[PDB]
Paper text:
Recognition of viral RNAs by RLRs leads to the activation of mitochondrial antiviral signaling protein (MAVS; also known as IPS1, VISA and CARDIF). Activated MAVS triggers rapid production of type I interferons and proinflammatory cytokines. It consists of an N-terminal CARD domain, a proline-rich region (PRR) preceding a poorly structured middle segment, and a monotopic transmembrane (TM) domain at the very C-terminus. The N-terminal CARD domain of MAVS is necessary and sufficient for forming active MAVS aggregates.
To test the energetic contributions of these charged residues to the stability of the filament and the in vivo MAVS signaling activity, we mutated them individually to an alanine residue or residues with reversed charges.
Numbering used by the authors: -1 to 94
The structure:
C-alpha cells in the first residue's frame, strides 16, 4: 500500500509529458537519486550503455516508481543537474 495518490499522479504526468523530460542525461542524474539501490544504479548504468539515453530514461522512471520517496529524490536530483524547471513542474503536480 506504499504508492500514494500523489506519487501515481506524478508518475502519470511524467508519462504523458515524457518529451518535456528528454534533456535529462541519465548518467549524470543517477548518482543523485538516493532512492535507488546500488544494484539499481549498477543495472541502470549497464542499461544506458546498451540502449542509450532515451530508452534508459523510460526504464529509469519505472525503476524510480518502485522505490520509496522517488518523487522527492527526483526533484532534488533535477535541481542538482541544472534542470530546476523540471523540478518545479514535478513538485507542482505532486502537490496538486
Amino acid at each position: 500500500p506504499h504508492m500514494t495518490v500523489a506519487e501515481d499522479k506524478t508518475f502519470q504526468y511524467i508519462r504523458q509529458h515524457h518529451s518535456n523530460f528528454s534533456r535529462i542525461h541519465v548518467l549524470r542524474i543517477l548518482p543523485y537519486l538516493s532512492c535507488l539501490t546500488t544494484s539499481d544504479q549498477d543495472r541502470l548504468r549497464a542499461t544506458y550503455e546498451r540502449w542509450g539515453n532515451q530508452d534508459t530514461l523510460l526504464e529509469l522512471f519505472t525503476s524510480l516508481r518502485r522505490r520509496n520517496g522517488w518523487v522527492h529524490s527526483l526533484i532534488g536530483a533535477l535541481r542538482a543537474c541544472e534542470l530546476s524547471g523540471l523540478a518545479d513542474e514535478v513538485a507542482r503536480i505532486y502537490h496538486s
